[PDB]
Design a protein around this ligand. Sequence first.
Ligand SMILES: O=C(O)CCC(=O)C(=O)O
Ligand SMILES: O=C(O)CCC(=O)C(=O)O
Ligand SMILES: [Cl-]
Ligand SMILES: [Cl-]
Ligand SMILES: [Fe+3]
Ligand SMILES: [Fe+3]
Lengths: 318, 318
Amino acid sequence: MNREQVEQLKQEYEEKGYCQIKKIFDFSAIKTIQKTLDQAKQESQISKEKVTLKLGGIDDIDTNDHAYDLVKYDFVSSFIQEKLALLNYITGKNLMIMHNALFSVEPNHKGLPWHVGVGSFSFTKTEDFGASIWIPLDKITKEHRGGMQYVSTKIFPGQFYYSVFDLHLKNNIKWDESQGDLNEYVANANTIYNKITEDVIDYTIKDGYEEDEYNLGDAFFFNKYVLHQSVPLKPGLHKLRRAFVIRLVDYDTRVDEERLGLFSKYSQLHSRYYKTLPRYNKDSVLVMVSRAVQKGLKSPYLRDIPHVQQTLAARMAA
Amino acid sequence: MNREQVEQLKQEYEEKGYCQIKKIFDFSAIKTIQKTLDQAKQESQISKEKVTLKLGGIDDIDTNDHAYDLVKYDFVSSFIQEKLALLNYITGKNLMIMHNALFSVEPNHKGLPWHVGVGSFSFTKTEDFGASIWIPLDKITKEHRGGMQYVSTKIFPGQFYYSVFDLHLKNNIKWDESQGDLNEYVANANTIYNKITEDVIDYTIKDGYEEDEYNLGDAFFFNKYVLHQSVPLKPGLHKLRRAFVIRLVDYDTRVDEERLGLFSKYSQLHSRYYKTLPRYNKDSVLVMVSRAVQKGLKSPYLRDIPHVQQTLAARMAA
Ligand SMILES: O=C(O)CCC(=O)C(=O)O
Ligand SMILES: O=C(O)CCC(=O)C(=O)O
Ligand SMILES: [Cl-]
Ligand SMILES: [Cl-]
Ligand SMILES: [Fe+3]
Ligand SMILES: [Fe+3]
């Protein structure tokens, strides 16, 4: 790239925990992502419960598509691997491609509320590294928005939010028939997590968030402590706005068996009460890790999971 | 000591972040502490503002004595140094004696509310080590209580509370004449810190806290992530109940210039508005560190502060 720009990127990420990277993908790569995800999406039937659970059972998710791991690591490296070098440099970390998600919003919807990636990076240790590349597949303009807002970690160091979220999950799991409807129990529980409403976030952050326009080819890179949300899409430009998101960890990132257990139990409890049948795309990263854990782990590191170890070269820089 | 007991102590601290240590001081040491603190206390005139600020300006402190560093490090090592070995072993850390406090409560007062030592260990980095020895100078019984309650870090990992508190301090410091009375501004600000009320703590913790009886000679040892509070003293046993508290850090504990600055600014702002004159006992640890910082620091470590480095032997195990 420019070199001068690359240094500004590194600089900005070091200050904020994020950076918008303009023109990182070529239009041809975008079109390939669009078509491929469009095909993958037509094939499977997906529900709102796994994104709801991921953000703690709060049920304020207003998104159209919430699909995890529709495509595999190989399709992803095929356009991401050549970029890992720039990201490794920006973060001073060695990145491995892991899991992905597709989100979309229709006009006049809130999409996802303010969050940090405690749901996305649930099966990994809080203090270990995690970051995301958010690739919008429909243009984000000043006039129609529909993109994201995001807050410098200088303003909102999101690492503390993980404990708060774990305390809340722990409460979820203490639910009882006596309690009444599970979802209402979770949403009204007097947990610290529930106290942190949008007004509170607003008062905390003020105007310190940033919202940027994106042309196809641009992406947003951010670590898992960055507080962020979807912005509503105004009608008249896109019927729907999609974004494809790649989750990356560090070579040394470790599994967190304890949170993984909390999520499973909560998921289990929710499916049992609501009589639902959670579907996971074959080769979903979460499923793969749960099995390795259920068998018992030899190593703490994600890299030493058998499927990962075998496919490691494709997951990392050349 | 017993050896079998010492292993239970180590075990318990590893689980909970705390342990009650029975009969660690002899009655003679206690009487010496009583007399010495009684003398030191008669001499100086102390206000409620520095404990109020330390817990974020909330003004729910209901204690009689809130005095910091009434005595010096040498008087403290004279009864503490011989115990550092047991504490170093329990925590697997090398402890340095640093600063101290005297708290007392009259019958039917709430003393201090639930807190973690973000006020006590304000000038040190969050992730660096801090712990306290709480030495009650008046007997704590099942019938009159007046002691403390405390929560396992397994139940409430208090490290997250430090960020929450720092976000709140940052808000304190954005106060304006336009805002109105500073204390009311701080107490009503819609900060995450203010959302975490007693009801919320109660809902989070449940009955998971522990309250123990203490005879003179017993003490409570706890790290700075442990959530704890004063319990009311029922009348008819003591006119007043005192406790002397020693704060310890690790040999490798570092100064946090940023929080130190926040506290100073907030303190400054509060004194300016209320026309108050903060007094600090000569050789207060906070004052000593502020000067070293204001001069500019050569090293990040507390040990490398000049006064500390000179007096290091007395601060550490033999
Ligand atoms: O695409 C969106 O609106 C939200 C995406 C998101 O939260 C993420 O990629 O982590
Ligand atoms: O003595 C009391 O009631 C409270 C003491 C306290 O909070 C401490 O020693 O950290
Ligand atoms: Cl996320
Ligand atoms: Cl404390
Ligand atoms: Fe997200
Ligand atoms: Fe305390």
